[PDB]
Write a structure and sequence with these properties.
This is part of a larger assembly, with two copies of chain A (about 55 residues) and two copies of chain B. In chain A, about 80% of the residues lie in helices and about 10% in strands. Chain A is mainly α and about 55 residues long. Chain A starts with a helix and ends with a strand. In chain A, helix 1 (about 1-25) packs across helix 2 (about 25-45). The radius of gyration of chain A is 17 Å and the shape is flat. Chain B is elongated, with a radius of gyration of 35 Å. By secondary structure, chain B is mainly α. Chain B has helices at about 1-70, 70-85, and one strand at about 95. The chains are: A mainly alpha (about 55), B mainly alpha (about 110). At the A-B interface, helix 1, helix 2 and strand 1 of A face helix 1, helix 2 and strand 1 of B. Chain B: It is found in: Membrane. Chain B: This is Modulator of FtsH protease HflC. Chain B: HflC and HflK help govern the stability of phage lambda cII protein, and thereby control the lysogenization frequency of phage lambda. HflKC inhibits the SecY-degrading activity of FtsH, possibly helping quality control of integral membrane proteins.
Chain lengths: ~55, ~110, ~55, ~55
């Protein structure tokens, strides 16, 4: 468990470090694209009901 | 007969002790083997995560510049694609109104 | 997976880059057509209730 | 766990807001992955702002 969690932490750190400069270059577009992808995934996974309030 | 039972019980005791010792040794060896297997798999998974992150960043660069060419139209198109993908399933229920702007032609002139 | 992601990103970039000048020439008509098509699909894929509020 | 926490802090101290955004998005993806819940949105919601006519 210790070895696996340390290695996974290193991998996640590397991924975030690589991804950060690209976002820093163009923040708005990356934010919008990631948000849309996450929302389409989550909405596809769950049942939905659209009613006005 | 009682003496025979006692000696048989003692011999069974010795045999059970020997088998238990063997099983303990086998369990220890299997445990260390499983630890080594898990460590190797974790190392490979870390390298794979690094590769996936590199690929995602490379794709993000192209998406960022080509879509900063025109942000609003990309937002429109991507939102429409997201709507289609999310509602593709038929497990949901949608409530509308004849006053909604999409059905503005449902009402006759 | 990395190679496939890069290839798909290149494909989507090419498609959007080709399609954008067509939009820029006549925005209203193409926007309306795309909107109508998307609503047609989404409403055809879900149940509808048209109770007034 | 202490070593992993040190690594995560040293990495994400560069930009906390972006890390929060990414981690929350992944949490939303992971939690809702099971098709057992029900969501109730509205057509006026900001995500569904492009479902209205131009």
């Amino acid at each position: 468990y210790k070895a696996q969690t340390i290695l996974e932490a290193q991998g996640e750190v590397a991924r975030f470090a690589k991804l950060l400069p690209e976002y820093k270059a163009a923040p708005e577009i990356t934010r919008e694209r990631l948000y849309i992808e996450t929302m389409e995934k989550v909405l596809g996974n769950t049942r939905k009901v659209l009613v006005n309030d | 007969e009682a003496i025979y039972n006692r000696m048989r019980a003692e011999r069974e005791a010795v045999a059970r002790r020997h088998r238990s010792q063997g099983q303990e040794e086998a369990e220890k060896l299997r445990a260390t083997a499983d630890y080594e297997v898990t460590r190797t798999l974790a190392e490979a998974e870390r390298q794979g995560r690094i590769m996936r992150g590199e690929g995602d960043a490379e794709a993000a660069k192209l998406f960022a510049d080509a879509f900063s060419k025109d942000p609003d139209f990309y937002a429109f198109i991507r939102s429409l694609r997201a709507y289609e993908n999310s509602f593709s399933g038929n497990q949901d229920v949608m409530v509308m109104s004849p006053d909604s702007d999409f059905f503005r032609y449902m009402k006759t002139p």
